[PDB]
Amino acid sequence: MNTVPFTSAPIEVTIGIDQYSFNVKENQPFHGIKDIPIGHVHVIHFQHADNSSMRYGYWFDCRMGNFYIQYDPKDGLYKMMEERDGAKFENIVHNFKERQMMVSYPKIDEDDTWYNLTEFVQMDKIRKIVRKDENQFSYVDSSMTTVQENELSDPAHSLNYTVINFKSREAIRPGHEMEDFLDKSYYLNTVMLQGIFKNSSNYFGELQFAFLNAMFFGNYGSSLQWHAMIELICSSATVPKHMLDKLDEILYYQIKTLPEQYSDILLNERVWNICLYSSFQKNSLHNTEKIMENKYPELL
Amino acid sequence: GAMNSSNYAELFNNDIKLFVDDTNVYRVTVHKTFEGNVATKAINGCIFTLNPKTGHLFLKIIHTSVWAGQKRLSQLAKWKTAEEVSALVRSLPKEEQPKQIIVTRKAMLDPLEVHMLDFPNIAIRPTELRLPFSAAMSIDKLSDVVMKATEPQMVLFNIYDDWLDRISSYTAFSRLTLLLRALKTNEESAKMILLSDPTITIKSYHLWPSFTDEQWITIESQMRDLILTEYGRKYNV
Numbered sequence: 001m002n003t004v005p006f007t008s009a010p011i012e013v014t015i016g017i018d019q020y021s022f023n024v025k026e027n028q029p030f031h032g033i034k035d036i037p038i039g040h041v042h043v044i045h046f047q048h049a050d051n052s053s054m055r056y057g058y059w060f061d062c063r064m065g066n067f068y069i070q071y072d073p074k075d076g077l078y079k080m081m082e083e084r085d086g087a088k089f090e091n092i093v094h095n096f097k098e099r100q101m102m103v104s105y106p107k108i109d110e111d112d113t114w115y116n117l118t119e120f121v122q123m124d125k126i127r128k129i130v131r132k133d134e135n136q137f138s139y140v141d142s143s144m145t146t147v148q149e150n151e152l153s154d155p156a157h158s159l160n161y162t163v164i165n166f167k168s169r170e171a172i173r174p175g176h177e178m179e180d181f182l183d184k185s186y187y188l189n190t191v192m193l194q195g196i197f198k199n200s201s202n203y204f205g206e207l208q209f210a211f212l213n214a215m216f217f218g219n220y221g222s223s224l225q226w227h228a229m230i231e232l233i234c235s236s237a238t239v240p241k242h243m244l245d246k247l248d249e250i251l252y253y254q255i256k257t258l259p260e261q262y263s264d265i266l267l268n269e270r271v272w273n274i275c276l277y278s279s280f281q282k283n284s285l286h287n288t289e290k291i292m293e294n295k296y297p298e299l300l
Numbered sequence: 301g302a303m304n305s306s307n308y309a310e311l312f313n314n315d316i317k318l319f320v321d322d323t324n325v326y327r328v329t330v331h332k333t334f335e336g337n338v339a340t341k342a343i344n345g346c347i348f349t350l351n352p353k354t355g356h357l358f359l360k361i362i363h364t365s366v367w368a369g370q371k372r373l374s375q376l377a378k379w380k381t382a383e384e385v386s387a388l389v390r391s392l393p394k395e396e397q398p399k400q401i402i403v404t405r406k407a408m409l410d411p412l413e414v415h416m417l418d419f420p421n422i423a424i425r426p427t428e429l430r431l432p433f434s435a436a437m438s439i440d441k442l443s444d445v446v447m448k449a450t451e452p453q454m455v456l457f458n459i460y461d462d463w464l465d466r467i468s469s470y471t472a473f474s475r476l477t478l479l480l481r482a483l484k485t486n487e488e489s490a491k492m493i494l495l496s497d498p499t500i501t502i503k504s505y506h507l508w509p510s511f512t513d514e515q516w517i518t519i520e521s522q523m524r525d526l527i528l529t530e531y532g533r534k535y536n537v
């Protein structure tokens with residue numbers, strides 16, 4: 001069980017760790033989060049009390065280094081940093097734990113929610129979407145635009161999701177225009193799965209990461225990417241059975257976790273109605289269709 | 301964006317553009333089977349592709365053989381239309397290719413956009429106008445060449461005959477749309493008006509009769525009356 005200590009908390013902030021969140025008052029004696037489960041990526045995220053504009057945070061994996069948070073009063077945010085001195089770090093944490101100045105990652109034993117949301121998400125792939133190679137952790141915020149958004153403006157601060165465009169030469173074989181547009185299997189299976197992602201695990205990892213950035217940061221380009229990756233599968237007549245079954249599980253837990261009061265903005269009516277009721281896979285997403293109908297029947 | 305009343309004069313500027321109407325591509329007669337079920341029989345159709353500035357009409361005849369063994373024909377018809385329009389554009393020299401293609405029905409947008417991916421600079425546009433190009437098969441010489449086709453065939457006509465020697469392309473388009481609107485609202489009357497006078501003939505190389513300028517004013521008036529008349533008989537006004 002790993003720890004992310006905080007030097008201090010000088011400004012009032014709501015802190016998220018994965019799907020949990022807690023309030024810290026200005027100058028409250030808070031020194032971090034302990035008992036973080038090893039084996040998953042995690043995200044620690046921030047919304048200041050005085051300017052709820054800009055949610056921001058850091059994707060990290062405690063297996064890749066010792067990370068801590070320190071507020072920077074010049075740039076005005078909580079920054080993640082890596083501590084290279086292992087003995088300094090262990091001693092800092094041990095002191096903070098001894099004074100009980102840390103919150104405990106509060107994982108109920110029965111609960112597989114975070115695993116189910118990050119099953120295919122891997123730090124190494126996050127770091128190719130979010131390019132900042134000098135750090136082992138990845139910063140994301142509400143305003144960062146995606147490469148595709150930038151084609152339609154600072155390249156260094158972009159989300160490099162895989163571009164998916166259904167009316168593009170990449171998606172449409174010369175001479176198969178109608179076929180490829182109405183049945184996207186060749187774009188899914190040959191261009192994207194075999195060609196770009198190499199396997200469905202990497203495809204699902206990007207889809208899950210896009211959803212989590214949409215949900216935790218209100219990142220609009222991430223929401224677009226999540227829906228595009230769903231629609232590409234649902235609009236393909238030929239999908240491996242194991243991918244459809246896994247997709248249904250992936251989406252079930254995403255819809256389960258989504259805050260009820262954010263569904264209006266985080267869920268695209270056209271995509272979901274098309275996917276659940278018109279598409280080739282309208283009959284292949286039983287768990288997802290059941291939770292959607294019982295939890296968001298208005299959207300449909 | 302969409303073509304409508306506000307930007308109507310753009311049709312007659314010097315940027316090459318084409319209207320594409322797919323109404324008459326997939327045509328059927330509906331009939332009863334021996335067992336008392338209903339079935340369709342396809343008849344030859346056509347794509348109506350028109351340069352409104354010059355009167356150039358590329359009439360691609362759609363022979364019923366293109367439907368043989370195919371499913372979802374009304375959907376296929378849109379993609380076939382898009383395939384043929386794309387082939388026409390590729391067949392034209394670069395300096396003759398359109399800068400815009402305006403589709404008369406919005407369901408042509410995605411099929412044509414996908415077939416034209418190779419031409420990212422050609423704008424594919426809808427229109428809010430209710431253009432009467434479906435009535436093209438009420439022009440006797442066009443209907444005749446479509447029904448007689450035994451194979452796929454492109455036939456070329458200026459739909460304005462020689463009118464541009466005497467009038468502008470705005471006025472010519474307005475005459476054409478008035479004639480076609482009349483033929484669409486009451487075909488028999490419209491054709492009675494056009495041929496009532498034995499002395500005015502259609503030249504072998506033309507579609508419409510050889511009216512003098514003054515006769516065109518009379519004709520145009522009779523067509524507007526017809527479109528108002530029928531509008532009363534329809535709405536009881």
Ligand SMILES: CN(CCO)C(=O)Cc1ccccc1
Nearest residue numbers: 355356357358455456457458
């Ligand atoms: C083809 N001819 C005579 C046949 O009507 C033209 O009047 C020019 C033309 C070129 C191309 C398309 C339509 C019209």
